[model samples]
Target: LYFQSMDLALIPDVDIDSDGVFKYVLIRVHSAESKEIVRGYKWAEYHADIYDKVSGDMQKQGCDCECLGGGRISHQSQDKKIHVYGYSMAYGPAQHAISTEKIKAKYPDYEVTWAN
Candidate 1:
């Protein structure tokens, strides 16, 4: 579907990391899209914040919320893409691996790969 895949390079600090100061690098992202950069942290912060209202929601019945701290944003996650590239990059590794692995195994080649 979307050929413009995203590569996430989770590099560690301590000089052994990349030439940059940060310990991670969002690879495959164009230079112009730098404005869309995501903080190495705060990822889960935004998700756990409103993970419920997004999907059909698994609330029992009249529940306010289970997890909070989403920066006051509530929206659904649509047009989600899968990571064709390996989960862990050459530097760091995640629980999931294998670059060939796909999400929908169909159209929309949107993938999040770790480029070590």
Candidate 2:
């Protein structure tokens, strides 16, 4: 399983008529099932963005795209070292390989292992 936490600082408006001292925090969690053990630790970053609309015509033209395609794309600040086995998809090896590859490309220094 993968978990994430974020701390946000909302700067309040200095104007007299503006809202005063607005701050907030956020937490996120992700998980994947695996049979093999994943190792190593390296700083990485994940980037994600959400789009509201997509061109239907473009999609109908065999455009392999998704509305939300953002997740742990890259990380260069912190590294997470843990074992694999208790994720979400332990039966699909092909999909796991592709997903892990993307992460490895972004963090060349980290080690990636596939489940048996």
Candidate 3:
């Protein structure tokens, strides 16, 4: 899904991969009335290993992020109900594999995912 309504401009701006142009992405999860606001942010369950490990992987992948976007496709686990969303500046099969592998390394049981 292509999303432009969100403030992409406000996402972190910095040189990525030693290039002058910086790309940013958002990692959002689908949810219901099961939430609250904190740290001036309304986001995911930072406690789960999936959350922390995925965040680590995103940073490692250089996922400069913003507060919102139209919403990206997510990978959902039929068993665990786990889902993940991320943008790849290197949005290709290779990059996606690398991202997917890292998540699998951490939580092999949960469904691994990335945005298209």
Candidate 4:
């Protein structure tokens, strides 16, 4: 995490338009370090980009990469926190806990919790 955590509200609307006019906000934060920001339409696709950069084989091995994206993730900046959701069946209960733990570690100053 060589970047700093960002409140998306701080980003000017013009910046987003200039940055390729993405449909979703990608908040990529690392454990107890810095944050990485990228914008894309498909969260899963964008997530994989940073996932490989940050965790690499760790994600491939199912270590629970905490990256987030998609349309719903647009609220992360408005909420000033990362939202971890949709872990009912695709993931185990322990996986949710592990992911949130990592997110909390990444955004130590923000409220990192489950979204739904």
Candidate 5:
């Protein structure tokens, strides 16, 4: 199926511990015209693997993150998106920005938007 958009929404400044606050962003892929989630955990369990592996791969570069996990899409209008939340620890802000660009780079065709 053709996905029309991919939204990455950051639930930032999350205090997981005394380790300091971090950011966690959720990813959702689907068509703008439909509520059906074409590529999210509600459809399959691979979102965890994909998010973890992607974060892990980025770790090899200059990002610090932990895949906090995610599931099902939201029903609210503005928040109508699925999630694969990843905690950006050491590099919260940077990780969010870099991850956004890198993700967009990987799926160039999809209309990716990062909700800061």
Candidate 6:
């Protein structure tokens, strides 16, 4: 799902102590399944491994550069019901696989489904 500019709202920023990186912007998605939740910021430093691209001219100048864009998933369970919150920037097949594995490992009884 593509998020329009009007559909998102910026919230408070976050700063990570380990890397000394500051998140200047925060976006929230207003959807039924994952409503009113603050989506995590995607910094270039966090995605160095996946954004590597090697081409002819670019390879000499360092083709492998970090690109930013992605979201996070959080869940809470009450009684026998589960509430899952997820947000994505450009989630693809590869990212889904990694996320699903991690979510399943953490919450065995919870089911994951994609929604717009």
Which candidate ranks first by lDDT, i.e. highest?
Answer: 4
Q: Tens digit of lDDT per residue, candidate 4, span 28-102?
A: 444323343433333344434433544553344333334444222222554556544442122222233344554
**All models, RMSD in angstroms:** 17.6, 18.2, 16.8, 11.0, 14.8, 15.7
Instruction: Write one digit per residue (lDDT tens) for candidate 5, span 55-115.
Output: 5544454344444333222222243322223443322322234444544454455444543
Tell me how far the alpha carbon of residue 114 in candidate 1 is from the true structure, in angstroms, after superposition.
Answer: 3.6
Q: Which stretches of candidate 1 lie over 4 Å from their true place?
A: 1-45, 54-56, 60-112
lDDT accuracy of residue 106 in candidate 2? 44
What TM-score, over all chains together, does every model reach?
A: 0.20, 0.26, 0.26, 0.34, 0.25, 0.27
Per residue, candidate 6 scores C-alpha lDDT tens digits across 6-56 of: 222231112111212222112222221121221222343322222332112
Regions more than 4 Å wrong, model 3:
1-78, 81-94, 113-116
lDDT of 2 by residue, 1-108 (tens): 954322112111110111111111111111111121112122211111111112232234322223212222222233432112222221222233544543355445
* lDDT value, residue 59 of candidate 3: 47
RMSD of 3: 16.8
Model 5: lDDT of residue 39 = 22
**Model 2 score (lDDT):** 0.24
How many residue pairs clash in model 6? Answer: 0
- TM match of model 2 to true structure: 0.26
Tell me the deviation in Å of residue 29 in model 5. Answer: 26
Could you give me the TM-score of model 4 versus the true structure?
0.34
lDDT for residue 45 in candidate 3, whole number 0-100: 24
If the candidates were sorted by their lDDT against the true structure, best first, what order would they fall in?
A: 4, 5, 3, 6, 2, 1
Worst 10 residues of 4 by lDDT: 12-21
Q: How many backbone clashes does candidate 2 have?
A: 11
lDDT of 1 by residue, 1-116 (tens): 73432222221110111112222212222321211112122233333222333222222221222221111111112433322222212323322222212212322343434333
Question: In candidate 3, how many Å is residue 57 off?
Answer: 14
